Amino acid sequence: KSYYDDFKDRLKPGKYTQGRCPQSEGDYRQESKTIGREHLNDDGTRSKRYTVKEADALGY
Amino acid sequence: FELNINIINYNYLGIIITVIISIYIYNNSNIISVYNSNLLLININIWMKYNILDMLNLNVLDYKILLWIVVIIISNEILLFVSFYWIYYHNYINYYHVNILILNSYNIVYNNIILLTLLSTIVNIKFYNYILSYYKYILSYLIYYNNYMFNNKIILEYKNNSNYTNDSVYMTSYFYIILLHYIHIYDSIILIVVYNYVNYKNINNYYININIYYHLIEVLYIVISILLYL
Amino acid sequence: WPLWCGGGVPDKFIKIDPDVHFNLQGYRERIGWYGFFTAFLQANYHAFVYFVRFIPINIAIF
Amino acid sequence: NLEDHFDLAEYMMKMHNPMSEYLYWIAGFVSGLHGILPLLHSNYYFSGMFLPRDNDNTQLCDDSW
Amino acid sequence: IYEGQTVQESELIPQEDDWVIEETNFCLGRNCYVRFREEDDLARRALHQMDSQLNKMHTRLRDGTVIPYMSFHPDEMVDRPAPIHTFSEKPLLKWTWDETYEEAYDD
Amino acid sequence: YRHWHRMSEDDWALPLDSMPEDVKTLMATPQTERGFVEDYWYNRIRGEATLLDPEALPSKSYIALARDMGLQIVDEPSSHMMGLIELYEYLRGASFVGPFGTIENPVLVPAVGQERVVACTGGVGDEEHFTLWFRCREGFMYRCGECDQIFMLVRLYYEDRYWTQTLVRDTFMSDGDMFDLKTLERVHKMWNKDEMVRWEVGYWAQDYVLGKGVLPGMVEEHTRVN
Amino acid sequence: FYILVNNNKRIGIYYIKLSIIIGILGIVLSYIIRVELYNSGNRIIKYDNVNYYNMVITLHGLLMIFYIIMPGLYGGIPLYILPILSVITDIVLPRINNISIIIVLISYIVVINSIVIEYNIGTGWTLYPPLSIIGTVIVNMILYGLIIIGISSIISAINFMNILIVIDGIIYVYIWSIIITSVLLIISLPILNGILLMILSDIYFNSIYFILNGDVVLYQHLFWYFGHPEVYILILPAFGIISIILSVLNNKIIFGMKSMILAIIMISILGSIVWAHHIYTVGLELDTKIYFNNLTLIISIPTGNKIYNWIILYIGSYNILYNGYQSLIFSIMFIIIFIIGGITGIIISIDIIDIGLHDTYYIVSHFHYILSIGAVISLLAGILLLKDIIGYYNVIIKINKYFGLLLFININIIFTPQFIIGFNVMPRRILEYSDNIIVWNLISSIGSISTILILLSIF
Amino acid sequence: IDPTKNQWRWCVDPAWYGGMRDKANMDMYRLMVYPFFGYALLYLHSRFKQNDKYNVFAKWR
Amino acid sequence: GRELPEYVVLPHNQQRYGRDKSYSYFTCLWHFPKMVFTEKWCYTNIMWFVFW
Ligand SMILES: CCCCCCCCCCCCCCCCCC(=O)OC[C@H](COP(=O)([O-])OCC(O)COP(=O)([O-])OC[C@@H](COC(=O)CCCCCCCCCCCCCCCCC)OC(=O)CCCCCCCCCCCCCCCCC)OC(=O)CCCCCCCCCCCCCCCCC
Ligand code: HEA
Ligand code: HEA
Ligand SMILES: [O-][O-]
Ligand SMILES: [Cu+2]
Ligand SMILES: [K+]
């Protein structure tokens, strides 16, 4: 049997090259405004404020 | 329960020190090099402050780790001097029959050996007081007098020597070996200028390090004296 | 010292509260530009202490 | 936090921005150019040509091209 | 040199005439690249990765004890990929000896 | 332990300037609500009040005497927890050597979390094998694939908390009769009279109950310059 | 952060990343060399720009040794797994670990900048005087890079030695491999620094050590007193990796662990006392030559014991396990390849054979088979074994039999012909050569272009 | 004296135990990055010019 | 102590991110220059570096 066909449904082919829309269509660089996600960007990556500019290891 | 080690996650002195080093290379003025050396001193002192502040972790292995690092460093200092002794003895077959004036075996060697011995005695007294949780103010100033005399004597010798570095590999090796010892003497000044009484006493790596280093430099001069003067 | 030879400081006499000492969020606005210059100068007390002890002997050599 | 458990979490979880990879490859490409560009510059400086023609430092037949 | 544990013949005697060697599969299963869901965010993809660790897997024997994923070196004991802080609780290397003291026992 | 550094001065006693100034509330606070400093001075004030009253000691039971000094009467539950705590701490900087583990008596692997990395070296002598590392997760009776040594994880967990000396004392010790401030005053007058203070802690403690600055020389004691 | 990170595992990744980057420059230089040597004539370097070729070979050697293989096998894999193998939370000296990688990068930038700005001349990676001291400022810049690199190497060695104080488990063979390399560095580097300072003194301080009545052979003694210990500082970490891979992948406990460890210690002591086999043709005394030749041949004994202990690790392993994994293939290929390099080393060890084969491409092929093939493959095999732990992706390497086969075949096409031209004879460090040596040079050149093409297929 | 009020020892890296003072020192050195780049780039230009590498084309024209 | 919901509904209905589209060997040759000249965060960082 082909085991790939079992979980084919889970793998929906992608639309964007590298999985992100142009920054103009959506600004993934900005911090998310969602409550409880102030440490994350819109695309889900950690925000520079959380990790660099106001890193807790530096006293923030 | 706590972790065995309080991990240090970030550090920025490394970038600064590495950039400071580059300035020595990428510069068009020797004044820039002088001021760059001050920057190096400052940032190396910050690293030393980080070491002192690590005392707050109350880690038993910290003393041992630093002590063994010093052992390795001393070893590297000894092996650098060995390389100069090697350079000196490789050309031994071309010495003592050239038309140059080698150094006397009476004046310089004796006053220097007597001087450096007194330096060891002072450091030894400092160690003894360190063991006895006591301090004597005059000790450090005796070191300053000893260093002053050593600097005064070495300067005059070089200025009144009638043979130059380009005269023979003998002269080059003599000057270079003596300079290498002097640099290590000056590094001893750098270390000793901060000597004070700290109330945490024998958990302070500074005290053991100074004792070891001073003994190394004096012992190194015994080897030099036998090779060159005697 | 806050080491074996000593211990902690009683609360009656603590002057650097970590809650206020840390939490540097927007500290530059609170201190201003002259404060930033002051803080930088004050961060190098350890280096200043060393230079005060190191320079004199070098002057003598010079 | 769960996001901080893994070092380089964005890359390991396959969310990193591709620009980071592009910069790494560009940096390697620039490093390679440090062997080719000075070759061309030095050739022109001492000869007037960026690259030689095979066996142009030796005697060549009349019809050689 | 190591040649396995020593066996006495008495320990090789079965309690039934039908005893044979247990045929339990020690192949953990079929695997591939860990496949993250698009919907999961960075935090939830971290949980997914932590639930796909082979070194957290084991094989349960007929008596209920489990033989774990084992390795010669501790490099295979950290989560894959390696987290920032790995051995918070010091890994314990168990040595065995025949020494004993009375306080540990009760009559 | 060998891994610990040198005793601090605080490890022996605390400075009297760390005594809480609201002694009246301190002696009425339940044990579960007392912090480390508050608990130190509650025990010291109450314990020294009973010890500095010789005429009452012989008639005081060990149960009551231990309570006054703040010492916890031991029992199998608390002994088990304290013992496993001290065993965890010892293993922080010490080797892990013991008898061969079997189903009846598995190798006990203390942990705070739900997992701890463990290595099996086999038996003694020729039965010793190369280190086989495995992740010991809770709720499974592990068997080495090579020597069949049985392992088990023991978790120092109690009610959303791990096991600590403070947790053991709070869970099993029961507050007795509320401390009476009359005893503090009575003992204070016993050992402190006519400018002689032979109970310094009770002179400071009585001063705070009086409101701070009431007793002779205490205003001068509390006036500092930096 | 990126540059501020002190995590020992992150720094290990940085070392591998930087080795690949700097490695691109190294491989490019190698392609220039092989292209030039394709025939007789000038191909890509003008006859008036022959100084560039001398610089290309010099930088190739220096970069591949000190900025690529050493940072990769002694800085990369070590900084990532050693603290884990030692069941310790992190490396003993966190801040020192950070500065070491930064130092390596800064010294690399200095070197490449010196290519662009300074006049391009070369004196070999062995910087023999008086040629090194009569050159232009590019030699001064290269000296600064080496001294700066030396600082990073020594502090990293200090870092690894401190693991003995904190190791909470057993010192595995790999840990022993790094510790001994660290010892070799602590003892050899200070001598190198001294001789490098003397090169500077003659370049920049009007010293006269390397002019008449001063013995130029002195430099070669002090240089090679570090030189040969360096070749074992570069190979011993590779041996440590090979031991782990074979034991893990074959599910077999290391055989003769103590003999493996004592073989590594032995190689180090012997490697510290055999340096003058690089100075056979200078004219040393007969007894010196015989001593060094004798002790050089002894190194084969401990090295041979390790090889045979590896073989029995692969023997007898279960057949059901798939043996086509790239890491396993590379580990096996190392044994096959290292024996070739070592045996040729024993051949050149005989001084009378060496008279004919000194400064010929036979020496090149000898140390390429060990480093360009053996060390590279060992680093690849080690990284491949730790792919899950490291977590990198976007490459097709883990199971790629085509890559392994093509690499093995083509790498041998490059260097096997270089053994032949060693008895032809074609000197080293030359660009033009007689027309009767074209065939073999051409074959090796075809091998070089092919290997580069195979490096593109991994992506 | 309360053991639980000193968590800044491990919550904050030692390089920033000084609060704003330690953050200021880092920030000040950060301000010198681009001035350093211009200074370093000048040195490359100085060597490049002194070696007559700008006249590569004018030499043969 | 902070209270957060189990989920949040975003105001927009744009599915901006997801799985990568299938890429070829030379996809980078056009995608990388596109990012440099078309993504603001990239060309603002380049101009800032060059200017200073
Ligand atoms: C030997 C080769 C073959 C090897 C084969 C075998 C390999 C086996 C496997 C080996 C695996 C090793 C272990 C891997 C572990 C990976 C871990 C990892 O991914 O870590 C995460 C790490 C970072 O991820 P993250 O955590 O998301 O980081 C977020 C950022 O921190 C924060 O994000 P952000 O966006 O805020 O970032 C800031 C960003 C901001 O960036 C931007 O804004 C960029 C804007 C666009 C700029 C694009 C470049 C423009 C260039 C223009 C040029 C114009 C020329 C004009 C010429 C005109 C001529 C007429 O950057 C910057 O501001 C600074 C950038 C500085 C670095 C780039 C430097 C470039 C070169 C500069 C040269 C300068 C020369 C000056 C000379 C002067 C002389 C006077 O990943 C990377 O950094 C990428 C790694 C990618 C490769 C990983 C390995 C894959 C497997 C191997 C593949 C084969 C590679 C072969 C080598 C390359 C060949 C070329
Ligand atoms: C890591 C790299 C590496 C390694 C491991 C070695 C290993 C050895 N090398 Fe080295 N060598 C170099 C790198 C290396 N070398 C480089 C880079 C140069 C040139 C530098 C320059 O000149 O610029 C060089 C140059 C060099 C020369 C100089 C020749 C010349 O200048 O003309 C010689 C000769 O003595 C030599 C000898 C040896 C020997 C005898 C070994 C031994 O270690 C080999 C031991 C291994 C075996 C012997 C095989 C395995 C053992 C067995 C199978 C047991 C059975 C075998 C026997 C009983 C013999 N090497
Ligand atoms: C370890 C160091 C190293 C490595 C890898 C190589 C690799 C190669 N070298 Fe080597 N070479 C030297 C060190 C090295 N060399 C030295 C020290 C000299 C003498 C210098 C002198 O004479 O002064 C020399 C000389 C030398 C010459 C002599 C030029 C001369 O002096 O006349 C020639 C060409 O014939 C050559 C060719 C090659 C080729 C074609 C490759 C390779 O391209 C073959 C193909 C292999 C690969 C392309 C893979 C390499 C990949 C990596 C190195 C990256 C690994 C990184 C990770 C795994 C993370 N080399
Ligand atoms: O060098 O062997
Ligand atoms: Cu050698
Ligand atoms: K040619």
Ligand SMILES: [Zn+2]
């Ligand atoms: Zn076992």
